[PDB]
Amino acid sequence: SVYDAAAQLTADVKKDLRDSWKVIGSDKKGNGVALMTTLFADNQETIGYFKRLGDVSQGMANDKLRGHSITLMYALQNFIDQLDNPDDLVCVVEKYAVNHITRKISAAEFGKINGPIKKVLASKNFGDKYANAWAKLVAVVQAAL
Amino acid sequence: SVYDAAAQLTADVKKDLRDSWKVIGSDKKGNGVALMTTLFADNQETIGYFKRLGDVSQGMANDKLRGHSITLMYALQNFIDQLDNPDDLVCVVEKYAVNHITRKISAAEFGKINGPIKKVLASKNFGDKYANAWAKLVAVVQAAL
Ligand code: HEM
Numbered sequence: 370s371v372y373d374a375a376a377q378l379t380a381d382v383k384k385d386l387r388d389s390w391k392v393i394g395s396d397k398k399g400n401g402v403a404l405m406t407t408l409f410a411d412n413q414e415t416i417g418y419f420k421r422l423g424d425v426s427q428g429m430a431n432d433k434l435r436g437h438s439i440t441l442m443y444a445l446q447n448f449i450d451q452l453d454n455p456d457d458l459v460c461v462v463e464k465y466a467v468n469h470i471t472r473k474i475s476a477a478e479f480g481k482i483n484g485p486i487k488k489v490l491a492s493k494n495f496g497d498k499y500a501n502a503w504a505k506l507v508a509v510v511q512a513a514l
Numbered sequence: 515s516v517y518d519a520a521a522q523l524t525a526d527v528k529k530d531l532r533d534s535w536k537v538i539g540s541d542k543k544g545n546g547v548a549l550m551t552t553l554f555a556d557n558q559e560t561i562g563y564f565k566r567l568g569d570v571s572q573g574m575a576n577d578k579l580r581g582h583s584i585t586l587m588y589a590l591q592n593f594i595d596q597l598d599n600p601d602d603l604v605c606v607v608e609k610y611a612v613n614h615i616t617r618k619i620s621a622a623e624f625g626k627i628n629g630p631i632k633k634v635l636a637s638k639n640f641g642d643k644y645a646n647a648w649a650k651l652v653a654v655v656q657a658a659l
């Protein structure tokens with residue numbers, strides 16, 4: 370359950386999430402678009418779900434993709450800000466889960482984002498330790514799907 | 515016609531928005547729920563769009579409502595952060611507009627949030643000057659509806 374998954378976010382996992390977010394979250398537009406383009410590059414099969422965005426290879430020049438990417442980063446910001454209170458983290462996670470459930474995005478599908486996160490992370494000199502911390506956060510959302 | 519609506523956000527309006535948000539956005543959970551419960555109390559008919567949230571009477575104690583309220587505040591945080599770049603503000607405003615259009619929420623219906631915003635601002639002692647500034651930000655989204 371999402372309640373069990375939220376409990377896996379221990380003291381050090383939270384710390385690693387905050388430390389890395391401090392850097393990644395500094396450039397939401399830049400890292401946001403980088404995140405999405407990497408997803409479409411590594412997992413070409415996911416592009417179908419983003420039909421509304423249009424020509425996704427345009428990257429930053431695509432207003433819809435840019436608007437979506439920035440918005441995704443504020444969702445991550447939301448998660449980071451709720452780390453102190455698991456009750457609040459859970460209700461926020463379940464809120465964002467609703468629309469993904471509506472789009473038939475499964476847990477396995479959602480998990481595709483870990484690759485892109487690991488990459489953007491590595492580009493900022495944050496290794497496996499941080500990639501794994503984020504994978505645990507993503508797992509909380511997966512549990513709600 | 516979003517860009518034209520954004521043109522109304524002059525240097526002083528943006529200054530008033532940032533200053534009041536410094537206070538309002540410091541307690542997203544508390545002020546977010548206050549906004550929603552005030553909307554429900556002032557315009558009972560708006561509850562019709564929120565059947566998914568359940569018993570909205572519980573207010574803060576209702577996990578679904580709390581989750582939605584906090585998330586709404588990050589949309590505003592997003593807007594405030596994009597004020598200086600019309601191109602980014604516009605693509606972000608249109609991104610958020612998609613789901614509201616899908617729910618058949620008209621510009622007039624969306625405009626009902628102005629009353630609640632005014633009361634919440636007043637709670638923190640921000641007068642009409644600030645309420646009008648926020649009305650202009652809301653008008654930008656209304657232009658996309
Ligand atoms: C860290 C991971 C992710 C976060 C935090 C996240 C967050 C969001 C948010 C906030 C939205 C905009 C609000 C909405 O319309 O629901 C959204 C939309 C969307 N997300 Fe996710 N998402 C993530 C990963 C994914 C993945 C991996 C997929 C696809 C396999 C996915 C598919 C979608 C789709 C299809 C949309 C709608 C796009 C549109 O038509 O504008 N998301 N996501």
Ligand code: HEM
Nearest residue numbers: 560563564566582585586589590613617619623624626627
């Ligand atoms: C300050 C203005 C507002 C902002 C910034 C805002 C923001 C948001 C956000 C971020 C979401 C969650 C993402 C999504 O599903 O699209 C949302 C959902 C929603 N909004 Fe708005 N909204 C505002 C005003 C309103 C008003 C006045 C109404 C209706 C009279 C409305 C009705 C809805 C509904 C029905 C949902 C879905 C809630 C659910 O079932 O969980 N919104 N809004």
